[PDB]
Amino acid sequence: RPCQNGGLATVEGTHCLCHCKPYTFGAACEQGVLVGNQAGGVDGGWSC
Amino acid sequence: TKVEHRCTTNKLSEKHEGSFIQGAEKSISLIRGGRSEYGAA
Amino acid sequence: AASGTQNNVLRGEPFIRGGGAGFISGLSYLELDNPAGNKRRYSAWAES
Amino acid sequence: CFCDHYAWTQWTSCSKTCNSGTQSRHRQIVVDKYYQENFCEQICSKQET
């Protein structure tokens, strides 16, 4: 179930982790603020 | 004899000061060829 | 009655791939006075 | 004018979702004796695109 704030997920063995975007943080990338240009909204992403 | 004198007075003032500045720079450069010591430079 | 408040943050995050082990730690040592990099250290990294 | 008095609104949802698109924001301009006298109508940009 996708990371917030444009972060890309990856699978740890039997588990999920997030490559968050800079200075936005936490397991789902919910906390903090982004840096650089931003498009707003939420870009779509697939379930399996 | 009876006498009475009376007055009321009012005053107001304001002052404001303001400043802003903004800057942006971009650089883009492509080097092709060089030793990467000076291609870096 | 008087109230006053200040805040500052700096974050900086140099990242390097390739380079000689010392030149890498040289270039990536962040300068508050020159956040992109000292030009000679950077040229030395670009040599190493 | 101190045009930074007025609102840091978020940018509007991107007009074209994925091609050559645009977004805009505006100051949430409320007029006052300050705005009238201190040249704000003259020097401040009301909306950024």
Select from C8, C1, C4, C10 the least CA-distant residue to C35. C10
Residue whose entry in the numeric block shows the structure tokens 């505006």: D26
Structure tokens, B34: 């060089």
Contact C43 B35 (CB under 8 A): no
Residue count of chain D, please give it: 49
Cβ atoms of A3 and A18 within 8 Å: the answer is yes
- What resolution, expressed in A, was reported for this entry? 3.5
Residue whose entry in the numeric block shows the structure tokens 């008095």: D5
C44 in reach of chain B (CB within 8 A):
yes
Going A43 to A26 to A10 to C17, the CA torsion angle's sign is positive
- C-alpha triplet C34, C46, A20: angle, nearest 5°: 65
Domains of chain D: 3-49 (2.20.100.10)
Contact B41 C47 (CB under 8 A): no
Solved with: cryo-EM
